[PDB]
From a paper:
Among the many trans‐acting factors that are strictly required for ribosome synthesis in yeast, Rrp5 is essential for the maturation of the two ribosomal subunits and, as such, has been found associated with early preribosomal particles 6. Rrp5 is a large multidomain protein that contains 12 repeats of the S1 RNA‐binding domain at its N terminus and 7 TetratricoPeptide Repeat (TPR) motifs at its C terminus. In vivo, the N terminus is required for A3 cleavage, while the C terminus is necessary for A0‐A2 cleavages. Usually, S1 domains are prone to nucleic acid binding, while TPR domains are seen as protein–protein interaction modules.
We determined the crystal structure of Rrp5 TPR domain using a construct from residues 1400 to 1729. The purified protein was crystallized, and X‐ray diffraction data were collected up to 2.35 Å resolution. The structure was solved by a SAD phasing experiment on a Se‐Met‐substituted protein crystal. It comprises 276 residues of 329 from the construct and spans from residue 1408 to 1418, forming a short α‐helix, connected by an unresolved linker to the region 1456–1721. Overall, the structure is composed of 14 antiparallel α‐helices forming a seven TPR‐repeat domain plus the additional α‐helix located at the concave surface of the TPR domain and interacting with TPR 1, 2 and 3. Several patches of conserved residues were identified and located at the N terminus and C terminus of the TPR domain on the concave and the convex faces. At the N terminus, residues N1471 to S1475 and the loop between R1508 to E1512 form a conserved and continuous surface on the concave face of the TPR rod (indicated as patch 1 on Fig. 2A). The interaction between the Rrp5 and the Utp22 protein would involve the conserved residues identified on the convex face. Besides protein–protein interaction, cryo‐EM‐based model also suggests that the pre‐rRNA helix 24 binds to the Rrp5 TPR module using the above‐mentioned conserved residues on the Rrp5 TPR rod 24. However, this site is partially blocked by a short helix in our crystal structure. The peptide had to be removed from the cryo‐EM‐fitted atomic model 12, 17. This suggests that Rrp5 has to adapt its overall conformation concomitantly with its binding to the pre‐40S particle, as for example with Rio2 binding to RNA 27.
Numbering used by the authors: 1408 to 1418, 1456 to 1721
Amino acid sequence: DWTASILDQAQRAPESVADFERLLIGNPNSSVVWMNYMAFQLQLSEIEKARELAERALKTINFREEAEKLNIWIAMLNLENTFGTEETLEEVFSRACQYMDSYTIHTKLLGIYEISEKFDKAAELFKATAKKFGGEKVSIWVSWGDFLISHNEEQEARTILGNALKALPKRNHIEVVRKFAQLEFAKGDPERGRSLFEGLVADAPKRIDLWNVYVDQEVKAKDKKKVEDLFERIITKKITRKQAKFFFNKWLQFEESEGDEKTIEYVKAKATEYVAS
Protein backbone atom coordinates (compact mmCIF):
# COMPACT_ATOMS: atom_id res chain seq x y z
CA ASP A 1 0.00 0.00 0.00
CA TRP A 2 3.12 2.19 0.34
CA THR A 3 3.12 2.25 -3.48
CA ALA A 4 -0.58 3.18 -3.57
CA SER A 5 0.40 6.52 -2.03
CA ILE A 6 3.35 7.04 -4.41
CA LEU A 7 0.96 6.51 -7.34
CA ASP A 8 -1.43 8.97 -5.68
CA GLN A 9 1.24 11.68 -5.22
CA ALA A 10 2.42 11.11 -8.81
CA GLN A 11 -0.72 12.72 -10.28
CA ARG A 12 0.33 -15.59 -6.48
CA ALA A 13 1.33 -12.23 -5.05
CA PRO A 14 5.09 -11.58 -4.81
CA GLU A 15 6.30 -12.48 -1.31
CA SER A 16 10.06 -12.98 -1.78
CA VAL A 17 13.13 -11.49 -3.42
CA ALA A 18 13.04 -14.23 -6.07
CA ASP A 19 9.39 -13.45 -6.80
CA PHE A 20 10.19 -9.79 -7.50
CA GLU A 21 13.35 -10.50 -9.50
CA ARG A 22 11.26 -13.02 -11.43
CA LEU A 23 8.61 -10.34 -12.03
CA LEU A 24 11.32 -7.93 -13.09
CA ILE A 25 12.56 -10.40 -15.73
CA GLY A 26 9.46 -9.79 -17.81
CA ASN A 27 8.41 -6.33 -16.58
CA PRO A 28 11.54 -4.16 -16.27
CA ASN A 29 9.66 -0.94 -17.08
CA SER A 30 7.03 -1.31 -14.32
CA SER A 31 7.60 1.21 -11.55
CA VAL A 32 4.78 -0.47 -9.64
CA VAL A 33 6.72 -3.76 -9.45
CA TRP A 34 9.86 -1.84 -8.45
CA MET A 35 8.01 0.10 -5.75
CA ASN A 36 6.28 -3.01 -4.39
CA TYR A 37 9.73 -4.61 -4.30
CA MET A 38 11.01 -1.51 -2.43
CA ALA A 39 8.06 -1.63 -0.01
CA PHE A 40 8.71 -5.34 0.63
CA GLN A 41 12.28 -4.48 1.57
CA LEU A 42 11.09 -1.46 3.58
CA GLN A 43 8.64 -3.54 5.62
CA LEU A 44 11.62 -5.68 6.71
CA SER A 45 13.45 -2.40 7.54
CA GLU A 46 16.03 -3.25 4.84
CA ILE A 47 16.61 0.38 3.95
CA GLU A 48 19.88 0.09 2.03
CA LYS A 49 18.41 -2.66 -0.12
CA ALA A 50 15.35 -0.51 -0.81
CA ARG A 51 17.66 2.33 -1.86
CA GLU A 52 19.70 0.02 -4.11
CA LEU A 53 16.47 -1.17 -5.73
CA ALA A 54 15.53 2.42 -6.62
CA GLU A 55 18.96 2.96 -8.18
CA ARG A 56 18.44 -0.17 -10.27
CA ALA A 57 15.00 1.07 -11.32
CA LEU A 58 16.50 4.36 -12.51
CA LYS A 59 19.02 2.48 -14.68
CA THR A 60 16.72 -0.38 -15.70
CA ILE A 61 13.45 1.39 -16.58
CA ASN A 62 13.52 2.51 -20.21
CA PHE A 63 14.62 6.14 -20.41
CA ARG A 64 11.54 7.16 -22.40
CA GLU A 65 9.15 6.11 -19.59
CA GLU A 66 9.17 9.44 -17.82
CA ALA A 67 6.03 8.64 -15.87
CA GLU A 68 7.55 5.41 -14.54
CA LYS A 69 10.72 7.34 -13.73
CA LEU A 70 8.76 9.95 -11.79
CA ASN A 71 7.20 7.27 -9.55
CA ILE A 72 10.67 6.03 -8.59
CA TRP A 73 11.86 9.55 -7.76
CA ILE A 74 8.78 10.17 -5.63
CA ALA A 75 9.31 6.75 -4.01
CA MET A 76 12.89 7.82 -3.15
CA LEU A 77 11.75 11.18 -1.76
CA ASN A 78 9.25 9.35 0.46
CA LEU A 79 11.82 6.75 1.47
CA GLU A 80 14.38 9.38 2.43
CA ASN A 81 11.82 11.59 4.17
CA THR A 82 10.60 8.68 6.32
CA PHE A 83 13.74 6.58 6.92
CA GLY A 84 16.68 8.77 5.92
CA THR A 85 18.23 12.02 7.12
CA GLU A 86 18.02 15.66 6.08
CA GLU A 87 21.21 15.25 4.02
CA THR A 88 20.09 11.98 2.45
CA LEU A 89 16.76 13.57 1.37
CA GLU A 90 18.48 16.71 0.06
CA GLU A 91 20.76 14.66 -2.22
CA VAL A 92 17.83 12.72 -3.69
CA PHE A 93 15.86 15.96 -4.07
CA SER A 94 18.69 17.81 -5.82
CA ARG A 95 19.33 14.74 -7.97
CA ALA A 96 15.63 14.39 -8.85
CA CYS A 97 15.41 18.05 -9.95
CA GLN A 98 18.46 17.42 -12.16
CA TYR A 99 16.67 14.56 -14.01
CA MET A 100 12.96 15.42 -13.92
CA ASP A 101 11.09 18.69 -14.13
CA SER A 102 12.48 20.64 -11.16
CA TYR A 103 9.21 22.43 -10.35
CA THR A 104 7.29 19.14 -10.39
CA ILE A 105 9.81 17.61 -8.03
CA HIS A 106 9.50 20.71 -5.83
CA THR A 107 5.73 20.22 -5.84
CA LYS A 108 6.04 16.55 -4.83
CA LEU A 109 8.31 17.22 -1.83
CA LEU A 110 5.89 19.91 -0.66
CA GLY A 111 3.08 17.36 -0.81
CA ILE A 112 5.26 14.90 1.06
CA TYR A 113 6.13 17.41 3.81
CA GLU A 114 2.41 18.13 4.24
CA ILE A 115 1.51 14.42 4.40
CA SER A 116 4.13 13.70 7.03
CA GLU A 117 3.04 16.91 8.82
CA LYS A 118 6.49 18.54 8.66
CA PHE A 119 4.70 21.86 8.40
CA ASP A 120 7.77 23.95 9.15
CA LYS A 121 9.64 22.29 6.28
CA ALA A 122 6.70 22.82 3.92
CA ALA A 123 6.68 26.53 4.82
CA GLU A 124 10.39 26.90 4.04
CA LEU A 125 10.13 24.94 0.79
CA PHE A 126 7.14 27.04 -0.28
CA LYS A 127 9.14 30.23 0.14
CA ALA A 128 12.07 28.81 -1.84
CA THR A 129 9.87 27.29 -4.54
CA ALA A 130 7.94 30.54 -5.03
CA LYS A 131 11.23 32.46 -5.24
CA LYS A 132 12.55 30.20 -8.01
CA PHE A 133 9.32 29.56 -9.95
CA GLY A 134 6.80 32.14 -8.68
CA GLY A 135 7.38 34.51 -11.60
CA GLU A 136 6.03 31.81 -13.94
CA LYS A 137 3.69 29.37 -12.08
CA VAL A 138 0.47 30.51 -10.46
CA SER A 139 -0.01 27.07 -8.86
CA ILE A 140 2.83 27.57 -6.39
CA TRP A 141 1.04 30.67 -5.04
CA VAL A 142 -2.35 28.93 -4.84
CA SER A 143 -0.85 25.88 -3.14
CA TRP A 144 1.11 28.09 -0.73
CA GLY A 145 -2.06 30.08 -0.02
CA ASP A 146 -3.89 26.79 0.56
CA PHE A 147 -1.24 25.76 3.09
CA LEU A 148 -1.47 29.04 5.00
CA ILE A 149 -5.27 29.12 5.06
CA SER A 150 -5.29 25.49 6.21
CA HIS A 151 -3.01 26.47 9.13
CA ASN A 152 -5.25 29.46 10.05
CA GLU A 153 -2.85 32.15 8.82
CA GLU A 154 -5.31 34.34 6.87
CA GLN A 155 -3.18 37.45 7.06
CA GLU A 156 -0.08 35.58 5.90
CA ALA A 157 -2.19 34.34 2.97
CA ARG A 158 -3.02 37.95 2.05
CA THR A 159 0.69 38.82 2.14
CA ILE A 160 1.42 35.82 -0.10
CA LEU A 161 -1.33 36.88 -2.52
CA GLY A 162 0.31 40.32 -2.62
CA ASN A 163 3.69 38.81 -3.46
CA ALA A 164 2.05 36.59 -6.09
CA LEU A 165 0.73 39.72 -7.76
CA LYS A 166 4.11 41.49 -7.71
CA ALA A 167 5.86 38.43 -9.18
CA LEU A 168 3.39 37.09 -11.74
CA PRO A 169 2.85 38.57 -15.21
CA LYS A 170 -0.22 40.79 -15.37
CA ARG A 171 -2.04 38.26 -17.56
CA ASN A 172 -2.18 35.81 -14.61
CA HIS A 173 -3.37 38.30 -11.98
CA ILE A 174 -7.06 37.55 -12.42
CA GLU A 175 -6.47 33.80 -12.23
CA VAL A 176 -4.38 33.82 -9.05
CA VAL A 177 -6.83 36.13 -7.28
CA ARG A 178 -9.74 34.02 -8.49
CA LYS A 179 -8.21 30.87 -7.02
CA PHE A 180 -7.41 32.51 -3.69
CA ALA A 181 -11.05 33.64 -3.62
CA GLN A 182 -12.24 30.05 -4.20
CA LEU A 183 -9.81 28.89 -1.51
CA GLU A 184 -11.34 31.30 1.00
CA PHE A 185 -14.86 29.99 0.33
CA ALA A 186 -13.71 26.37 0.53
CA LYS A 187 -11.28 26.44 3.50
CA GLY A 188 -11.12 29.93 4.92
CA ASP A 189 -13.18 33.08 5.28
CA PRO A 190 -15.99 33.36 2.67
CA GLU A 191 -16.28 37.07 3.46
CA ARG A 192 -12.66 37.30 2.27
CA GLY A 193 -13.49 35.35 -0.87
CA ARG A 194 -16.44 37.67 -1.48
CA SER A 195 -14.17 40.68 -1.17
CA LEU A 196 -11.66 39.20 -3.62
CA PHE A 197 -14.36 38.44 -6.21
CA GLU A 198 -15.86 41.93 -5.77
CA GLY A 199 -12.52 43.43 -6.76
CA LEU A 200 -12.28 41.13 -9.77
CA VAL A 201 -15.63 42.14 -11.25
CA ALA A 202 -14.86 45.73 -10.20
CA ASP A 203 -11.80 45.70 -12.49
CA ALA A 204 -13.07 43.41 -15.28
CA PRO A 205 -16.84 44.05 -15.38
CA LYS A 206 -17.16 42.48 -18.86
CA ARG A 207 -15.52 39.18 -17.74
CA ILE A 208 -18.87 37.41 -17.42
CA ASP A 209 -17.18 34.10 -16.53
CA LEU A 210 -16.05 35.80 -13.32
CA TRP A 211 -19.65 36.66 -12.40
CA ASN A 212 -20.37 32.96 -12.95
CA VAL A 213 -17.57 31.57 -10.76
CA TYR A 214 -18.60 34.13 -8.14
CA VAL A 215 -22.22 32.98 -8.06
CA ASP A 216 -21.15 29.32 -8.08
CA GLN A 217 -19.23 30.04 -4.88
CA GLU A 218 -22.19 31.81 -3.32
CA VAL A 219 -24.47 28.90 -4.29
CA LYS A 220 -22.02 26.28 -2.97
CA ALA A 221 -21.99 28.18 0.34
CA LYS A 222 -25.83 28.32 0.50
CA ASP A 223 -26.38 31.89 1.79
CA LYS A 224 -29.54 32.17 -0.28
CA LYS A 225 -30.01 35.92 0.21
CA LYS A 226 -26.45 36.63 -0.98
CA VAL A 227 -27.09 34.27 -3.91
CA GLU A 228 -30.23 36.21 -4.82
CA ASP A 229 -28.60 39.64 -4.50
CA LEU A 230 -25.81 38.39 -6.77
CA PHE A 231 -28.17 36.91 -9.37
CA GLU A 232 -30.09 40.14 -9.68
CA ARG A 233 -26.90 42.17 -10.04
CA ILE A 234 -25.71 39.87 -12.82
CA ILE A 235 -28.67 40.32 -15.17
CA THR A 236 -28.27 44.07 -15.06
CA LYS A 237 -24.98 43.60 -16.87
CA LYS A 238 -23.43 43.31 -20.29
CA ILE A 239 -24.53 39.80 -21.17
CA THR A 240 -25.88 38.21 -24.28
CA ARG A 241 -29.24 36.55 -24.62
CA LYS A 242 -27.58 33.18 -24.71
CA GLN A 243 -25.88 33.90 -21.43
CA ALA A 244 -29.01 35.46 -19.92
CA LYS A 245 -30.88 32.17 -20.40
CA PHE A 246 -28.02 30.38 -18.63
CA PHE A 247 -28.10 32.60 -15.57
CA PHE A 248 -31.90 32.54 -15.32
CA ASN A 249 -31.90 28.76 -15.73
CA LYS A 250 -29.21 28.44 -13.04
CA TRP A 251 -31.21 30.85 -10.87
CA LEU A 252 -34.47 28.92 -11.27
CA GLN A 253 -32.73 25.58 -10.79
CA PHE A 254 -31.15 26.80 -7.54
CA GLU A 255 -34.52 27.95 -6.17
CA GLU A 256 -35.90 24.51 -7.04
CA SER A 257 -33.31 23.16 -4.60
CA GLU A 258 -34.59 25.59 -1.94
CA GLY A 259 -38.32 24.77 -1.97
CA ASP A 260 -39.46 28.41 -2.20
CA GLU A 261 -42.02 28.25 -4.99
CA LYS A 262 -42.91 31.91 -4.51
CA THR A 263 -39.49 33.08 -5.70
CA ILE A 264 -39.26 30.22 -8.25
CA GLU A 265 -42.25 31.85 -9.92
CA TYR A 266 -40.61 35.25 -9.42
CA VAL A 267 -37.74 34.08 -11.62
CA LYS A 268 -39.93 32.63 -14.39
CA ALA A 269 -41.85 35.91 -14.40
CA LYS A 270 -38.74 38.07 -14.45
CA ALA A 271 -36.85 35.73 -16.81
CA THR A 272 -39.59 35.65 -19.42
CA GLU A 273 -39.99 39.45 -19.26
CA TYR A 274 -36.24 39.86 -19.67
CA VAL A 275 -36.61 38.23 -23.10
CA ALA A 276 -39.34 40.83 -23.59
CA SER A 277 -36.59 43.44 -23.55
